[PDB]
Every structure is written in structure tokens, then in C-alpha cells.
């Protein structure tokens, strides 16, 4: 499975689209003064670097 992951085969992306469906992530800025600094978000996969 490790080798399959590093090879970045086409099947890996399809699997990743399944483990990402309803898995919230906690986006967080650096100076989180109030509680709204760290908020959950559902992931949408993009092709950029940001």
C-alpha cells in the first residue's frame, strides 16, 4: 500500500475521494484570539497548492 501511494496511481485518487467525503478539517489561523479562529470545514479537493 505504501508503494501504491508513492506511485500516485489512478486508483489512489479514487480511494482518496472516498475517505474525504464527510471528513471535516479544522482550518486555523495563527493569532486565534476568539473561538471563531479555528473552524471546521468539509474538504473539496483542488489541483493548486493553496
Amino acid at each position: 500500500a505504501k508503494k501504491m501511494v508513492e506511485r500516485e496511481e489512478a486508483v489512489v485518487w479514487d480511494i482518496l475521494d472516498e475517505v474525504i467525503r464527510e471528513h471535516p478539517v479544522l482550518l486555523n489561523r495563527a493569532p486565534t484570539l476568539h473561538r471563531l479562529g479555528i473552524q471546521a470545514f468539509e474538504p473539496v479537493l483542488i489541483e493548486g497548492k493553496a
Binding site: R21, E22, H23, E42
Partner: protein
């Protein structure tokens, strides 16, 4: 995909308890071999548990009663 959980928190006002009572259902559907009571709409176990809570099919009392029934069945199985 449940976007807002307001309909779910109608059942449990505390909200902290709502997470605790849905974790049990999610574990029962993930670890244990229990089929969901709602039509599985290609959603993960957590969203299925939340949706089940919304319809009024799963709460603390019903889940505890089901656990008691399972315990009674285990007692019958062990003679």
C-alpha cells in the same frame, strides 16, 4: 450529507450530549455488525447516525433499551 445539525439538536438541547449519543451509534454501525435503520445514502457512519437521530429513531433511551435486549439475548445464548 448533513450540512446543518439544527434539526438534530432539537432532540438533544445540551448539544454536548448529542455528540456522545451519536458516537455510540456510529461505533455500533462501524465496529459492530448493526445495519442502519435509515436508507444508506452513500454516507459515512457519522452522517448516518445524525440522520437517524433527526428522524427520531435513535436517542439515549432507545439505544439503552436495544442494548438491554442484546444483553438479554446474550443471557439466553449462554443458558
Amino acid at each position: 450529507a448533513r450540512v446543518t445539525v439544527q434539526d438534530a439538536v432539537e432532540k438533544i438541547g445540551n448539544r454536548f450530549d448529542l455528540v456522545l449519543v451519536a458516537a455510540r451509534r456510529a461505533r455500533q454501525m462501524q465496529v459492530g455488525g448493526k445495519d442502519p435503520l435509515v436508507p444508506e445514502e452513500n454516507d459515512k457512519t457519522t452522517v448516518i447516525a445524525l440522520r437517524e437521530i433527526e428522524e427520531g429513531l435513535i436517542n439515549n433511551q432507545i439505544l439503552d433499551v436495544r442494548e438491554r435486549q442484546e444483553q438479554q439475548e446474550q443471557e439466553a445464548a449462554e443458558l
